[PDB]
Design a protein around this ligand. Structure first.
Ligand code: F43
Ligand SMILES: C[C@@H](OP(=O)(O)O)[C@H](NC(=O)CCCCCCS)C(=O)O
Ligand SMILES: O=S(=O)(O)CCS
Ligand SMILES: O=S(=O)(O)CCS
Ligand SMILES: [Cl-]
Ligand SMILES: [Mg+2]
Ligand SMILES: [Mg+2]
Ligand SMILES: [Mg+2]
Ligand SMILES: [Mg+2]
Ligand SMILES: [Mg+2]
Ligand SMILES: [Mg+2]
Ligand SMILES: [Mg+2]
Ligand SMILES: [Mg+2]
Ligand SMILES: [Mg+2]
Ligand SMILES: [Mg+2]
Ligand code: NA
Ligand code: NA
Ligand code: NA
Ligand code: NA
Ligand code: NA
Ligand code: NA
Ligand code: NA
Ligand code: NA
Ligand SMILES: [Zn+2]
Lengths: 548, 442, 247, 548, 110
């Protein structure tokens, strides 16, 4: 009955969501808000403590002439002020990014061939187990060879470890299960079959370096760190000279020949090394999110968990801090994961597609784009017209543009089974929206959306790429909020409607199907809510080595 | 007529080819064969049509272990290679009679492509080769099969990979000997960022040709970097002549005298004697039972020493048929010769320095790898200015199968395509002939 | 060849170790089998593993360098490349890290030598490594107290000696027996137990260590007092410095 | 009377320091160590909690067959096990790098010219003060213009602020002193005169973004985050349209035209953005350390505090984690700031030069280099020969080489008053050392030192550079431990002997002369000791937003 | 003359070198041209502007014909002017690195 966002609007406002008028200016400014009151009090203390003025509600303009709203985290019953969804104030969000940044995937296939072919030694399930006990001591920062080594505190680095996975069940069975990501346990049967077939007899490590190190350093540290301790553990477990010519082969394999970075490095204007947000392709971001393996009967939920994953990471942390900073971009992102608004629009779209074509049974062409994207765009925009509370909730045109186009794009890909027509749907939505309301987003919002139609199907050097392969460094997409996370969701959408186990990299998919991660990638929006309630416990804190 | 020096030029069987050749006729700035090899390397691309076809059929595009389920396209690309390649050539060429070259290899599985020089003449750098080649093949494949607008982006991904999301052509099914301009350690470095394995692949493990190709590229880069300008120019030319071109048969004769039973140290003794015999060095002072040698011509001593260094690599790593000790040879040849003579080692310590770090980063956990993955742009081996990497190429040419990351592993597509080009495969011949040819123009 | 300047015994010793015409004094007798046990790459009587086919079975490229350069026998056979690594006490061990690498590339064919402060290594084809290793262990390259055969856990070059005059070894691969005054190797170079220990003979006495050592030390012959050797080092510094600026 | 390291040798061992024999193997292995016992227990707890084995003292070889030594932090009376000086287990070391990474210097000279010349508005001390109150609200992440902005928790970002300085005393006096780095207060009179003459009437911001953001993100975040909040505060304080054409001029000024990063970005093989350790030139590192302004009558102490700053940052954090990782390189670096060893050698060398030439009075030529570097190298190597305990303490050759050459290079620079001849003495010291002991450092230690002599005075493209401009990205220096921190020291040396206020940038020097920094840059070794004792309280923790 | 080299606000006290570069611009430009050129009368151009305060330099096309890209221009021009300035005033080995920093900046650290 109700649209899915009605509960959230009712909690925000005294009016029914349909009402067109309200009361402003007599709400107390910042004093209506628990969180802003906390901030005023903290600012006075901070300023007094350090002898420099800091947060002050009387600087600039007076916040809270209108209702300072709670947001429902979509799919939860958690309502929080928007400040609690800022990544600086949300440890769940910070740990999500840390769990990605500190992760690399590193094969043992070349390494095992160096052992057998250059060294002339055997590799077996037993030698692999011994190696994994060894690297689980060494990886967090502890010694295996030299005398008089000094080591990291095990408690400070408790979240670092190494697991393996392999498509060969018998071999997986022979390795201590403590070290094994069990594909049969973590995935439903049909997805397990696909992933195992993709991996085959390959054996892959999932290496997580310590959060504390990742925060001290950067993402490009991760594959170096990983390779050093692999290198040490290969020396110790396989009885090499500790530093012979063959040792260099293990280094080159671990750092280059069989390494899978989460993110690739970025060009000079946004110079960063590997494993920074801008290098993570949309298809990997979809595969990091683990909604696919638990919510597989619900293609919308899967796609929108991905949207939430990407919107927070790419808009709040990446574009809102790495590429800009300050107050930043919380509500550009929260529009895509709060109030059940994207959910209502995308469930509408899924239902339209299901009724009219059947999921993945529409023709993969422009006729389908025009139908589905147009229909869903009009639905979304009519909700804003019918529910003044909804419009005042998502007050920024950018926010509405992202949300409506995300629904349109995902629904188009639900019909076609193809992400590229999904993407064309997203751009068409933008153009329809722009004409309907004679506005779209912020000043520079549709740089990519005006290039967008022409670049969906281009094949040219820096234009052409399947959407799954694009990411934040795709040239048109390199700068602006309210797109990257939704593109990740449109990359997920056709794969979710098809029942595909992964979007772009089955190693990446399996690599985050691990209960030893700190962040729960199966329930990203649940975690964001936990972090908003100040209930999430991150890794990497230094309380053990500071005063009481 | 800038430098009085003349060198005798030999072939790779030790036969005098041309006597009394002015040093500057071997200069990258003057020698037309060096110019042709460099312009060649800028413009040549290998196309893996089989890889493109297989990536399309499996939807495995965009890098390691990547796949997009449901995007698979089954196209008989290799079965229609001739039409696809002819259609690509039409796009690549500027006019019908230019130096565009497109040749199928492996029954259509591969293509050698040389983009027309006219494109490079109005280009800042060399990336038109891959980018013009890649788009010509993408468009030729799409036209061949009438691939839909909806699906054509998969052809692009199969050919050029994850680019422009990655900075590199990640997962691409084309290759060049050069790497992208963004990866240069410094401006002027692009001819240094050619993997040793690619040089050894292209010269088919012929040791002297591999040394020649590597030295030509290394010392040509020294000109582009400005290192061979003004005071240092003669040193760099003598280095190319004596270390990479077997000038005066010095390398060849040292190897002959020391190949049966010889060691690094025996090569050293012969080199010092030969420099003494030739008047390059003379005793400057006697200490106690110890002769301190000097020289009135440091650049010529350097060149003689660099010749011995190459010969020492060929003796040492030749005797093992195992390339790994080239890092050791590069160090102790130079360490030993300094205490043997009282004179500075090759490149005034810089080869020794490079060798220290290269030894480390080919026998440790921290990085690097076998000798074949290094190159003059690699942070480990960029320090000597042309006098180290040509030895690494000679060593990998002589390796009989001790390497996991061999040219077979890293450079197979380069081997198939780039070895087809005679000037790349047998550069010493062409450069000698050109120097002979321009001899009286200096 | 003159190899190394200097008028001290240290400098002469450095020259002798490099000079392949100097007969190294043999100090101990070690069986073929025991060399193999100590190396720990294969067991005695196990066939040499191969990394590629014999050279005779392969079609090498036509190449005058290959024609002129005779391969060592293990290269002809396609043997693995394996290693032996030694740590030398700074308390007057006879051989020292740069002296070894320098001497190895003067004496030995086909050698990949590496020099570090606490470890010095040679890698080469396995059957040839076995022959070189007999010489490295039997001659005055090695003292069983001041030198140790170690493929890992090399610590001890810079450590004080124990009460027996033995160099520290985290894995105690070499045990001084007080009853014979001899050292036995009880483990291979990587640290695994040998079935039967190998006799390495008596440590050299203090006077003999002084005569034979190639390290300079204030309580031995100090490097600063080898003024001609300090020469050539300062000379090389200056000429390298000048060279990199102009010629 | 005693060498400076004797007490520390007496603390570590039962034997007198000259004794050549000791006892091994009966010390209980790791059980001799309080810190290793803590680690064993923490490892047991970590593995039990997470279900994967982790630290385990029986993996690989058994540490503590010799004495696991305490180390004295040099200049202190604090003795700690080496694990307490690992950057992972030392909050002071992590905060030191965070204070550098989260700092940028931003002119107000162009900005004020835009206000005056393009907006046609006035700039006075009073408008600057208003702007600074405004930017001190905004910089930590709080709003000044839009309605319904969500904001950072002020207590989580308490360490972020903006100050200014200028060489004009009368102008400095009119800006509110809460925001001013007072040069005349922080610097002795002659140094203050020099610094003020360098700055002149220029007005510079020192901007520090929040540690919590720097740790979530990267160094290249800093100038962006800075510029966003400068830009907001310029709009608010000078009454611009909130987003007009002139706004872009402030952006380009703050991001490009008058920004001074601490570090420049790095090439692709070691890809990193700005404000990473590899980009910080040795002259800047010397200028960040504030020993010069407090220990100005003691050039050794100033030079060695710089060595401590750089050995820790460049070897432990940068080379030992960003560029590698694992156990890493604590004692490669601790050799240059523990046991008063480098101090002994450098005071020897300073005394020698003073008695023979007079500080800064030696000919600047190779004769002085040969003299001083040979003398001091022989001195330091003789110490290891005369004291076996000292040799067992600094057990790795690389450590000795870096210590001995640092003393030789600093002493040669004390003599000539020029860093470049100091650097030549550093290389000569390595060559003499190598011949003396027939060993030098690790396998790859003297890559740069065999290139060294020739590249000291070279003028070629990627070879020639005054030492003050070199850093960790100078090609020969890009890879290896045991050099970069010592080179910062040698860059400091001649300027410390000369009494110079700065080594390479006067703005960098003033920018860290700020009591509101978390880490105390006037006493780097003291701070390292405080962090080792777990008595240092860093910024950036998430305690306030996680469970109790 | 100020020792201000290596970037904005950068200075190395005690490294100042007082050289009349502009006063000797014609000798310095002629010596630099001799190093930039490949052959006498090739297409090298070195032209002084602003009374010797500026120089227009065109590096011979033969250098680009055997180059991968275009950085020979700044690199050859920089080293030729560094060497020409050094040679003009006989700048010592100890001090010449300051001429290098004044011409090409903080490169290769940056
Ligand atoms: C396996 C290697 C080769 C390699 O690529 N790196 C190693 C090992 C690595 C590991 C050793 C940790 C472990 O035991 O598990 C780490 C800590 C780097 C990492 N992965 O975290 C390291 N070396 Ni190493 N490494 C060092 C050193 C050295 C000295 C040790 C000589 C001595 O006699 O003990 C030698 C080189 C030398 O001979 O000059 C050495 C070699 C070696 N280095 C030999 C093993 C030597 C042996 O088998 O015991 N390091 C040192 O000289 C001091 C500092 C020290 C580093 C740790 C720190 O700084 O605290 C450590 C730095
Ligand atoms: C060689 C190189 O690594 P690769 O050769 O590219 O694998 C380089 N490493 C380093 O320099 C490691 C630095 C510190 C480890 C050795 C310290 S002495 C790097 O990763 O960029
Ligand atoms: O107003 S602008 O569109 O410039 C920025 C919106 S965050
Ligand atoms: O043993 S190595 O010199 O390779 C590394 C020293 S940490
Ligand atoms: Cl010359
Ligand atoms: Mg009502
Ligand atoms: Mg209504
Ligand atoms: Mg009402
Ligand atoms: Mg096996
Ligand atoms: Mg168990
Ligand atoms: Mg067919
Ligand atoms: Mg068509
Ligand atoms: Mg001879
Ligand atoms: Mg016998
Ligand atoms: Mg006033
Ligand atoms: Na309500
Ligand atoms: Na306000
Ligand atoms: Na930038
Ligand atoms: Na605490
Ligand atoms: Na004591
Ligand atoms: Na252990
Ligand atoms: Na890299
Ligand atoms: Na001309
Ligand atoms: Zn970080």
């Amino acid at each position: 009955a109700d649209k899915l966002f009605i509960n959230a609007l009712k909690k925000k406002f005294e009016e029914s969501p349909e009402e067109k008028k309200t009361t402003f200016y007599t709400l107390g400014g910042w004093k209506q808000s628990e969180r802003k009151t906390e901030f005023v009090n903290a600012g006075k203390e901070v300023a007094a403590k350090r002898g420099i003025p800091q947060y002050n509600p009387d600087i600039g303009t007076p916040l809270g002439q209108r209702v300072l709203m709670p947001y429902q985290v979509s799919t939860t019953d958690t309502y929080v002020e928007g400040d609690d969804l800022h990544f600086v104030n949300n440890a769940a969000m910070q740990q999500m990014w840390d769990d990605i940044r500190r992760t690399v995937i590193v094969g043992l296939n070349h390494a095992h061939a160096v052992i057998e072919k250059r060294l002339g030694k055997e590799v077996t399930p037993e030698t692999i187990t011994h190696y994994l006990e060894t690297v689980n001591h060494a990886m967090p920062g502890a010694a295996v060879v030299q005398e008089h080594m000094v080591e990291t505190h095990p408690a400070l680095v408790a979240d670092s470890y190494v697991k393996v996975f392999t498509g060969n069940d018998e071999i997986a069975d022979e390795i201590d299960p403590a070290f094994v990501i069990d594909i049969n346990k973590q995935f439903p049967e049909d997805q397990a079959e696909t992933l195992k077939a993709e991996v085959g007899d390959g054996i892959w490590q999932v290496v997580r370096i310590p959060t504390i190190v990742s925060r001290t350093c950067d993402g490009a540290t991760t594959s170096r760190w990983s390779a050093m301790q692999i290198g040490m553990s290969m020396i110790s477990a396989y009885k090499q000279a500790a530093g012979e010519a063959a040792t260099g082969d293990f280094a080159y394999a671990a750092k280059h020949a069989e390494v899978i970075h989460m993110g690739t490095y970025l060009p000079v204007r946004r110079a960063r090394g590997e494993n920074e947000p801008g290098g993570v392709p949309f298809g990997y971001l979809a595969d990091i999110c683990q909604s696919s393996r638990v919510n597989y009967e619900d293609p919308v939920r899967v796609s929108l968990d991905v949207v939430a994953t990407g919107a927070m990471l790419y808009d709040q942390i990446w574009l809102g801090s790495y590429m800009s900073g300050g107050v930043g971009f919380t509500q550009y992102a929260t529009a895509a994961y709060t109030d059940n608004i994207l959910d209502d629009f995308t469930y509408f779209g899924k239902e339209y597609v299901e009724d009219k074509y059947g999921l993945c049974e529409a023709p993969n062409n422009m006729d389908t784009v025009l139908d589905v994207a147009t229909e869903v765009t009009f639905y979304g925009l009519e909700q804003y017209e019918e529910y003044p509370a909804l419009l005042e909730d998502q007050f920024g045109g950018s926010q509405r543009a992202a949300v409506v186009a995300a629904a349109a794009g995902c629904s188009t890909a639900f019909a076609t089974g193809n992400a590229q027509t999904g993407l064309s749907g997203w751009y068409l939505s933008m153009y329809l929206h722009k004409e309907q309301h004679s506005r779209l987003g912020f000043y520079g919002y549709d740089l990519q959306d005006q290039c967008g139609a022409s670049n969906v199907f281009s094949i040219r050097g820096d234009e052409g790429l399947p959407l799954e392969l694009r990411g934040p460094n795709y040239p048109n997409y390199a700068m602006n909020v309210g797109h990257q996370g939704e593109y990740a969701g449109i990359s997920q959408a056709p794969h979710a409607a098809r029942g595909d186990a992964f979007v772009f990299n089955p190693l990446v998919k399996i690599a985050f199907a691990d209960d030893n991660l700190v962040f729960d990638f199966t329930n990203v929006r649940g975690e964001f809510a936990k972090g908003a309630l100040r209930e999430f416990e991150p890794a990497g804190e230094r309380a053990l080595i500071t005063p009481a | 007529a800038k430098f009085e020096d003349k060198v005798d030029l030999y072939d790779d069987r030790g036969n005098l080819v041309e006597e009394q050749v002015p040093l500057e006729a071997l200069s990258p700035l003057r020698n037309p064969a060096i110019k042709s090899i460099v312009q060649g390397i800028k413009r040549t691309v290998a196309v893996n049509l089989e890889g493109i076809e297989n990536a399309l059929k499996t939807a495995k595009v965009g890098g390691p272990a990547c796949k997009i389920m449901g995007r698979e396209l089954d196209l008989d690309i290799v079965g229609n290679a001739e039409s696809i390649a002819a259609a690509a050539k039409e796009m690549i060429q500027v006019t019908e009679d230019d130096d565009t070259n497109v040749e199928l290899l492996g029954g259509g599985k591969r293509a050698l492509v040389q983009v027309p020089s006219a494109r490079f003449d109005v280009a800042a750098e060399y990336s038109a080769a891959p980018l013009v080649t890649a788009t010509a093949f993408v468009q030729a494949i799409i036209n061949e099969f009438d691939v839909s607008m909806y699906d054509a982006n998969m052809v692009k991904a199969a050919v050029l990979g994850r680019y422009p999301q990655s900075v590199e052509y990640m997962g691409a099914n084309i290759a060049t000997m050069l790497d992208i301009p963004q990866k240069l350690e410094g401006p002027g470095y692009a001819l240094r960022n050619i993997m040793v394995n690619h040089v050894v692949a292209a010269t088919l493990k012929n040791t002297l040709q591999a040394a020649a190709l590597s030295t030509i590229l290394e010392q040509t880069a020294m000109f582009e970097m400005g290192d061979a300008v003004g005071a240092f120019e003669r040193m760099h030319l003598l280095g190319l002549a004596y270390q990479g071109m077997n000038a005066d048969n010095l390398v060849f004769d040292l190897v002959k005298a020391n190949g049966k039973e010889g060691t690094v140290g025996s090569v050293i003794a012969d080199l010092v004697e030969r420099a003494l015999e030739d008047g390059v060095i003379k005793v400057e002072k006697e200490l106690t039972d110890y002769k301190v040698y000097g020289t009135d011509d440091l650049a010529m001593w350097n060149a003689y020493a660099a010749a011995g260094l190459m010969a020492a690599t060929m003796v040492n790593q030749g005797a093992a048929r195992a390339a790994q000790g080239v890092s050791s040879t590069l160090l102790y040849y130079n360490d030993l010769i300094e205490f043997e003579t009282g004179l500075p080692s090759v490149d005034f310590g810089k080869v020794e320095g490079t060798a220290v770090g290269f030894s480390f980063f080919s026998h440790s956990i921290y990085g690097g790898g076998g000798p074949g993955i290094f190159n003059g742009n690699h942070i480990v081996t960029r320090h000597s200015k042309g006098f180290a990497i040509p030895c690494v190429a000679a060593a990998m040419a002589l390796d009989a199968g001790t390497q996991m990351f061999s040219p077979e592993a890293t450079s197979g597509l380069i081997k198939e395509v780039f070895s087809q080009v005679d000037e790349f495969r047998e550069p010493l011949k062409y450069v000698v002939e050109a120097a002979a040819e321009i001899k009286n123009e200096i | 060849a003159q190899y190394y300047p200097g008028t001290t015994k240290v400098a002469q010793n450095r020259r002798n170790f490099c000079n392949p015409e100097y007969e190294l004094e043999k100090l101990r007798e070690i069986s073929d089998e025991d060399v193999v046990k100590i190396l720990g790459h294969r067991a005695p009587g196990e066939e040499y593993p191969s990394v590629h086919p014999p050279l005779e079975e392969m079609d090498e490229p036509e190449d005058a360098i290959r024609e002129m350069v005779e391969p060592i026998d293990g290269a002809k056979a396609g043997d693995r490349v394996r290693y032996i690594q030694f740590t030398d006490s700074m308390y007057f061990a006879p051989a020292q890290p740069y002296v070894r690498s320098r001497a190895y590339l003067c004496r030995y064919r086909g050698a990949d030598a590496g020099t570090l402060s606490g470890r010095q290594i040679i890698e080469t084809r396995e059957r040839d490594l076995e022959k070189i290793s007999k010489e490295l262990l039997e001659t005055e390259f090695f003292d069983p107290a001041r030198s140790g055969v170690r493929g890992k856990s090399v610590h001890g070059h810079s450590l004080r000696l124990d009460e027996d005059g033995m160099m520290f070894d985290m894995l105690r691969r070499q045990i001084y027996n007080k009853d014979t005054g001899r050292v036995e190797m009880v483990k291979n170079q990587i640290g695994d137990e040998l079935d039967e220990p190998v006799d390495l003979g008596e440590p050299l006495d203090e006077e003999t260590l002084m005569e034979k050592t190639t390290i300079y030390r204030v309580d031995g012959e100090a490097y600063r007092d080898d003024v001609e050797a300090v020469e050539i080092m300062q000379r090389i510094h200056v000429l390298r410095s000048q060279g990199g600026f102009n010629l």
